[PDB]
Amino acid sequence: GSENFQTLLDAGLPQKVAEKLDEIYVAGLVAHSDLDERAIEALKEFNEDGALAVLQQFKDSDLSHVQNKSAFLCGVMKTYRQREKQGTKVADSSKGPDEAKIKALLERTGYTLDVTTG
């Protein structure tokens, strides 16, 4: 991993967040200090899902010649909340399809003259 794994654990944030953050600091996706104190502060008070949401998109952001990764990260945190609570803006984003598998239910059969069986 990277040295920045352990700061997160001590800054207030759970392991389950840092486990999904270390990857970013190893992929070549950041320059270790690609963020600023202001982007840290808005990344102390989150819930369990919160940071995971923000870290996800950030791994797939258009970063190739960004000048300020902090602006990007302090952006995405202010949209995902729309699927979390009534505490954000109407911003755009593109997640959570249609579609839903059964996976918990079962079928039936009843051979009789009244039923469209095979």
Swiss-Prot record:
Posttranslational mods: Phosphorylated on tyrosine. The membrane-bound form found in microsomes is phosphorylated in vitro by insulin receptor tyrosine kinase (INSR). Phosphorylation is inhibited upon binding to RNA, whereas the cytoplasmic form is poorly phosphorylated.
Oligomeric form and interacting partners: Isoform 1 is a component of the APOB mRNA editosome complex and interacts with APOBEC1 and A1CF (APOBEC1 complementation factor). Part of a complex associated with the FOS mCRD domain and consisting of PABPC1, PAIP1, CSDE1/UNR, HNRPD and SYNCRIP. Isoform 3 interacts with HNRPR. Interacts with POLR2A hyperphosphorylated C-terminal domain. Isoform 1, isoform 2 and isoform 3 interact with SMN. Isoform 3 interacts through its C-terminal domain with SYT7, SYT8 and SYT9. The non-phosphorylated and phosphorylated forms are colocalized with PAIP1 in polysomes. Interacts with HABP4.
Location in or out of the cell: Cytoplasm; Microsome; Endoplasmic reticulum; Nucleus
Tissue expression as described in the entry: Ubiquitously expressed. Detected in heart, brain, pancreas, placenta, spleen, lung, liver, skeletal muscle, kidney, thymus, prostate, uterus, small intestine, colon, peripheral blood and testis.
Domain notes: The domain containing eight Arg-Gly-Gly repeats (RGG/RXR-box) may be involved in RNA-binding and protein-protein interactions. It is methylated by PRMT1, and essential for nuclear localization.
Highest taxon of the lineage: Eukaryota
Residues of the full protein shown: 24 to 140 of 623
Summary of the function given for this chain in its UniProt record: Heterogenous nuclear ribonucleoprotein (hnRNP) implicated in mRNA processing mechanisms. Component of the CRD-mediated complex that promotes MYC mRNA stability. Isoform 1, isoform 2 and isoform 3 are associated in vitro with pre-mRNA, splicing intermediates and mature mRNA protein complexes. Isoform 1 binds to apoB mRNA AU-rich sequences. Isoform 1 is part of the APOB mRNA editosome complex and may modulate the postranscriptional C to U RNA-editing of the APOB mRNA through either by binding to A1CF (APOBEC1 complementation factor), to APOBEC1 or to RNA itself.
Record's protein name: Heterogeneous nuclear ribonucleoprotein Q
Coiled-coil ranges from the UniProt annotation: none
